[PDB]
Amino acid sequence: MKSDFKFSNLLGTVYRQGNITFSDDGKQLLSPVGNRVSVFDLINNKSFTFEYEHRKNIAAIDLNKQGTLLISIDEDGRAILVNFKARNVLHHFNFKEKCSAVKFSPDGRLFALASGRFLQIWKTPDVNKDRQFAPFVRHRVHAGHFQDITSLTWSQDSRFILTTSKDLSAKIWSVDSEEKNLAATTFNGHRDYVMGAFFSHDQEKIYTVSKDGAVFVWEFTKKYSWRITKKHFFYANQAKVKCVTFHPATRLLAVGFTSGEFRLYDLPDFTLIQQLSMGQNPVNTVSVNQTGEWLAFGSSKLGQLLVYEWQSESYILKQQGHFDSTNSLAYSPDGSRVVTASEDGKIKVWDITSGFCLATFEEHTSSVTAVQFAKRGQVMFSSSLDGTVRAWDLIRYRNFRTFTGTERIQFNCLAVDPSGEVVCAGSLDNFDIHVWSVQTGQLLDALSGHEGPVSCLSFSQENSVLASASWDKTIRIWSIFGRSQQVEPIEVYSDVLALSMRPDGKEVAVSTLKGQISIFNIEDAKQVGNIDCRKDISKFFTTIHYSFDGMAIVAGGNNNSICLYDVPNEVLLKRFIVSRNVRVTSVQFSPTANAFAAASTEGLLIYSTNDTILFDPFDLDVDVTPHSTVEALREKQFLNALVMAFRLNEEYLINKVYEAIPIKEIPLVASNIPAIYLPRILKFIGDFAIESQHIEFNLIWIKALLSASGGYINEHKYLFSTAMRSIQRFIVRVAKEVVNTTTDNKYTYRFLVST
């Protein structure tokens, strides 16, 4: 294509250490990660922004009171400002050093920074644009202290400052030089180090906690001084307070520990509501709802990357996993579902197009080297280094079989037939590929034909030919369903690790023993050989894939980018991943032909085909006005309205001109459309179908259009196969939804005759 290709989403929610915060709305979830910044919502999880200007791994994010002023803080300690869509409106270089505490004003007027050993207050501007060398103007400074500020509280008046630092003192500063109570009174008398100080919103109570789990409350009295309200002496907890937060209800406390638990407290009673231990991995950060209904907590990178949502009545709202680095991907037979392979020995299910992780499967003894489905959808498969290879179901929760029988600890590559009848596995150190039956799991014959170790196993859609790449400069062709075996071709150069096939049984790409990428036919005539890999931060050719449309291939090494090619010689694009300290280990294409795959240590997945870019498919400005000519063609000539409508690519036009015409005209327009205006609208109509609520509407469209040129689209496959996939997923998903309620409404009246 000619599209822009980039990540508007990713693989994995939280892989690195980060903070945690909700929104002001309560229906959005701010889930950061150590290198980049992504914003989520509650329902239909989508990656909103991508703030990446970091060279060091930490990030801090908060909004003011309306969610239009958003920042991130790395260890470099400079500020980026985006509105809603990762624009980077203001790039404000703040510091060379990081910041320990930072907080807005609740009125959105002032801004609070705590760094070095001082206090820095900066002006908060409204919704505007750039054009500012320094959009942040100093309001006040407050000096001095003894050392660095560890935590911070503000006032609803936005004129009072209650803070604490490493010096075990809770200092007081006036915002607008008012000198509220004319003092900077430090609160002391603490037996251990003060972890958190929090000010109650009644202007009466003073909350302090120390690291021994002792809570001291002091009074707003400045005989005439601040006397004691309550003391604590706990010597039985044997833990350390890692994170502490205070509630806007001003009634509860929520305490996170280093011990891997989370304890609930009530402020006037000083009672334990419930403690929740789920392991030994510590809870790093914690965030509170703005009314305090839901409870979420962040955790360390070395600890858990697993963040669980909660309530005040103790039940989990949302769970998530995302353990260590991704080894391979596998596309579902509808493509909307994404399974993960990791070093831990777990396989996880992820509809990451909506963010959800429904379930997982865990029977491994060691890591997983590859994941791959079957196109029937009934079964997927496990390629691991466990010593066996097991089969799996979608939602029925049953390991069918673990296929093994020889002494082996390393099962590397794998291939199946599209029928699911026989499965062949390539042993790494053993020079044998093993067939296994769908009946019982029988080893009929063993194929000792190798002298180097196997590297790739790929079977065709022609379903007569097995292709194999081994580490002995020899490409291997095989026949099982016939009566014999075929003479395997001899490569010119290049022990091959990475092999790629066409699903027609005709085109085959090989990665060479360097950055050259050569492709050839089944009559072994070399089409292209692609130049070595550039990009110093030595050569890699590790993964390769032939695209499903048959017009492109995607190449991946480990030098932190990805490469794009067509069927002719040339490069389509080269997309570089900007990151500081191998990247790519698995590449394949999406069956819906909207993106493709990438397995990495980081995890990043989608390639974002767009429509806002103007295209000229069929000489658009012969159709001079895009509006008034269309308004003329909404009264008359509905055939030319759609031919004009396909030459345009403004979706605000397409829904209306596609909506306006009546029902009876639809088979007539389906009868008379040319075949060159067809595949992009049949491609788009499936993705466009899932969002709207006009299902009978598009239903009568796709019956006429689907009935129109079925022999031609049967003649012009590999494109209408993909568009066919994109519509058929919508077909079955709505179908199984409405049939069940149709029968469950159907039996009622006969039951009324029954009793």
């Binding site: 150190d429 022990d495 030595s538």
Partner: protein, 133 residues
Amino acid sequence: DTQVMRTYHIQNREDYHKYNRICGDIRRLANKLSLLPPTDPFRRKHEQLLLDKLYAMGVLTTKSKISDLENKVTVSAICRRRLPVIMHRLKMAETIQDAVKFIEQGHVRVGPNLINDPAYLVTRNMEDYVTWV
């Protein structure tokens, strides 16, 4: 001790302190399994389960016996498993220090992968894959 560090040219003394503990993990495990009555099939099987791992680990190069577990398990058997120590043996290199500097400026390719780590560990069976550049 000190000369063993000098002969093997180890970067850190704590690297010697690592493998003594790793030997110490095996050695008390060698003790406790040996502290069993001789009629136990649990005892007889699982000694062989431990031995057959350590052959392919390259610590037990030759085929060994039961009492050699107390004997042949040394830190120096682990010290021979290092990358340049294996590199000097098959005689594509020239000295000990020559094996070092080629890993330094990157002239060693093990299989399909480029490796420049000096603390790389080589097994008994993966050693056929070291290639030039």
